[PDB]
Amino acid sequence: VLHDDLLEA
Amino acid sequence: GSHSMRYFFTSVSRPGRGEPRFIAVGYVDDTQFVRFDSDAASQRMEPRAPWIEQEGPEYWDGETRKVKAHSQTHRVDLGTLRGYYNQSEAGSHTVQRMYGCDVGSDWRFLRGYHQYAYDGKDYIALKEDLRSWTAADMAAQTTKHKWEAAHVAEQLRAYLEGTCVEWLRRYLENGKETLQRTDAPKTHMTHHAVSDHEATLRCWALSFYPAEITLTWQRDGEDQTQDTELVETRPAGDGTFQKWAAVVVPSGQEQRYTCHVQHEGLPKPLTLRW
Amino acid sequence: QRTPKIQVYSRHPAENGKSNFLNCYVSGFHPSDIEVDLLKNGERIEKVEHSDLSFSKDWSFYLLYYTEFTPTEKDEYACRVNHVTLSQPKIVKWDRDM
Numbered sequence: 001v002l003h004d005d006l007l008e009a
Numbered sequence: 010g011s012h013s014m015r016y017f018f019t020s021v022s023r024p025g026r027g028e029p030r031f032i033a034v035g036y037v038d039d040t041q042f043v044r045f046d047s048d049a050a051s052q053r054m055e056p057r058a059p060w061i062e063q064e065g066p067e068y069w070d071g072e073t074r075k076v077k078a079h080s081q082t083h084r085v086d087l088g089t090l091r092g093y094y095n096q097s098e099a100g101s102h103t104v105q106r107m108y109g110c111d112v113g114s115d116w117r118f119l120r121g122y123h124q125y126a127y128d129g130k131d132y133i134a135l136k137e138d139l140r141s142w143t144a145a146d147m148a149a150q151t152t153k154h155k156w157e158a159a160h161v162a163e164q165l166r167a168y169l170e171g172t173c174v175e176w177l178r179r180y181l182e183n184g185k186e187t188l189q190r191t192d193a194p195k196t197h198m199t200h201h202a203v204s205d206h207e208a209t210l211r212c213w214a215l216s217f218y219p220a221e222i223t224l225t226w227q228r229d230g231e232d233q234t235q236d237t238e239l240v241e242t243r244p245a246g247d248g249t250f251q252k253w254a255a256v257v258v259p260s261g262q263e264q265r266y267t268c269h270v271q272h273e274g275l276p277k278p279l280t281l282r283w
Numbered sequence: 284q285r286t287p288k289i290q291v292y293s294r295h296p297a298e299n300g301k302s303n304f305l306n307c308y309v310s311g312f313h314p315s316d317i318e319v320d321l322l323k324n325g326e327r328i329e330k331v332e333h334s335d336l337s338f339s340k341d342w343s344f345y346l347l348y349y350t351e352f353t354p355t356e357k358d359e360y361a362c363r364v365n366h367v368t369l370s371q372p373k374i375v376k377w378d379r380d381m
Contacts, residue, residue, distance in 0.1 A: 001068075001176045002016060002035075002075040003108065003168045006082040007161050009089055009125070009133075009152045017337045019344075021315060032336045044335045057335070103314055105342055129285070129313040129342045199380060211380070240381075243308045244334075246294045246349050253381075 010191075010219075010273050011119065012038050014177040015109030020083035022091075022102045029087060031080040036109075037180050037188060039220045040248065045076045052077075060184030090127050093148035103128050108135075108165070110173035116181070121169030139166040192218045192249055193274030198281050202260065210283055211255040212268035216245060223271040224254035233266075285343055286368035287312035289375045291361065297354050297379045305352040305377065307362035310345035314367065319348045322361035322374070328352075354379070 015036045020029040028047070034057075035043035042058035049055075054072040056062045083104050091102060108123040123135040131145040133152050140162055144153040156162070181188050194214035201209045212224055220242050226233045236257040245251055258266055263283040270279040288311040294304035305328075309319055315336060321328040334347040352360065360377040 001172065002072055002079065003165065004075060005164070006079055007156060007159055008082055009086040009155070019315060019336055019338065034335045034337050041335065041337075046335070101314070101316075105338060107338075126342045131342075201380065240290065241288065241310065243290050243292065243306070244347050246304055246306055246347060251292070 011111060011113050012116070012177065012181060012188075013109055013111045014173060014180065015107060018079060018083065018104075018106040020080070020087060020104045022087045024099055024101055029080075029084050031083060033076050033079065037177065037184070039218060039250070040184075040188060042180070042184075043072070045073075045080075047080060058184065058187075060180070060186070060188070063183065090132075090148065093151065094127075104132075105129070108169070110169050110177060112174060112177060116174075116178055118170050118174045121165075121173060123165050123169070135162065135165060139169060187248075191272075191274030192216060194222065194252075194270055194272050194279075196268075196270055196279060196281055198268060198283055200263070200283060203257075204260075206260055207257060208260045208263065209255055209257055210263060210266060210268075211253050212270075212281060214252045214270055214272075216247075216249045216251070217272055217274065218249045219273060220250045221273065222250075222252060223269075224252060225269045226254060226256045227267050227269065229265050230267075284368045285311060285313040287317065287364055287366055287373075289362055289364055289373065290381075291375050291377045292381065293354070293377075293379070294349075299355050300353065302351065302353050304349055305360055307348045307364075307375075308345070309348070309364060310339070311343045312345075312366055312368070313343050315344045316367070317344075317346065318365040319346065320363040321348060321350060322363055323352075324359055325361070 017034050019032045022029050031047035033045040034041055040058055042061045044055050044057050054069055054076050086104055087102055105126040110121040111119045113119045125132045133149045134143040136143055142153045144150045194217035197213050199211045226237055238255045240253050242250055242252045256266055268281040287309045290308045292306050307319055321331050328350060331348050331350045338344045362375045363372050365372045
C-alpha cells in the first residue's frame with residue numbers, strides 16, 4: 001500500500 | 010532471498026492547458042501489481058497482478074484516494090520547482106518519485122528509501138538512516154528546510170519500517186504461488202561464424218525470475234572480459250526475463266571457453282561449453 | 284536529454300510458421316515522451332500494446348511494446364523509434380539470433 005500523505009516541496 | 014516493495018511516480022507538466030500527465034506503478038520484487046494513469050478513463054488504482062485482486066473494494070477506495078493525492082502534490086511541485094529554478098511557463102518539465110522498502114531472507118526490514126528527481130536529475134533523497142536528507146542544490150536545500158521543519162522524515166520512517174514491511178509481507182503470502190517461486194534460467198549456447206578465423210559464442214539465459222543474474226565467460230578456467238558483449242536484461246513479456254553474453258574466439262578453439270551462470274534459482278552455478 | 288536504447292526480439296524461440304510475440308524494448312531515455320512502432324515489411328503493425336511507464340535508478344525511462352506475431356521465411360520485422368533526441372527515426376531490424 002501507498003504512503004498516506006506527501007508534503008509539498 | 011531478499012524482497013522489496015517499490016512505488017514509482019512520474020509527472021509531466023502540460024504547457025498550454027490543464028494538469029500534468031501522472032503515471033504511478035507499484036512493484037513487489039520484479040512483479041508489477043498496481044497502476045494509476047491520469048489519462049485513463051477509470052480514474053482508479055487498477056490491479057496488474059492476480060493476487061492483488063483478492064483485496065476488497067475498501068483497498069481500492071483507499072489506494073485510489075492516496076494516489077490521486079500523490080498526483081496533486083506532484084502538480085504543485087512542478088509549479089514550485091519552476092519558480093525555484095526561475096524557468097518560463099513555456100516548457101514541459103518532469104518530476105519523478107520512488108519510495109519503498111527492502112527486506113532480507115527472514116522478511117525483516119533491511120532498508121528503505123525515498124528519492125525525488127527534477128528533469129531527470131537528483132533533487133532530494135532520504136538518507137539510509139531515514140532521519141536526514143540529501144539535497145543536490147540550493148533549490149533542493151530549500152525543500153530540505155521545509156521538510157525538516159515539518160518532521161517529514163519521521164513520518165516516512167514510520168511507514169518504511171512499519172506499514173511498508175507489513176504489507177509487503179502480506180503480499181508475499183497472498184501471492185506465494187508466483188512471488189515465492191524462483192524460475193531458474195533455461196540456458197543454451199549458439200554458434201556463428203564471422204570469417205574463416207573468427208567465431209562468436211553466445212550464451213543464453215531465458216525465462217528466469219527474478220531479474221537478477223550474472224553471466225560470465227572464462228578462457229581455460231580464467232575470467233575473460235575482453236572481446237565479450239553483455240546485453241541489458243530485458244523482459245520477455247510473460248513476467249520472466251532474458252539475457253545473453255557473447256565472446257569472440259579463434260575458429261577451432263571453441264572448446265576452451267565456458268559460460269558461467271549465477272541466479273537465485275540455481276543451487277549451484279551452471280557451466281556451459283560448446 | 285538521453286536517447287533510447289533499443290532491443291527487438293521474440294518472447295519465445297522463433298520458428299517459421301509458429302505462433303509467437305514480437306517485442307521492442309526501449310530504455311535509457313529521457314524525457315519520457317516517445318514514439319514506438321512495430322513494422323512488418325516496412326508497414327506499421329497496428330494492434331501493438333505497451334507496458335506502464337517506469338524508470339531505472341538513474342531516472343531514465345523504459346517501455347515494452349509488443350504484439351502477437353507468427354514469423355515466416357519471407358517477412359521482415361522491425362522496430363521504429365522517434366524521440367526528441369533523434370533527428371531521424373531509428374529503425375532496428377529483428378535479428379532472430381539476438
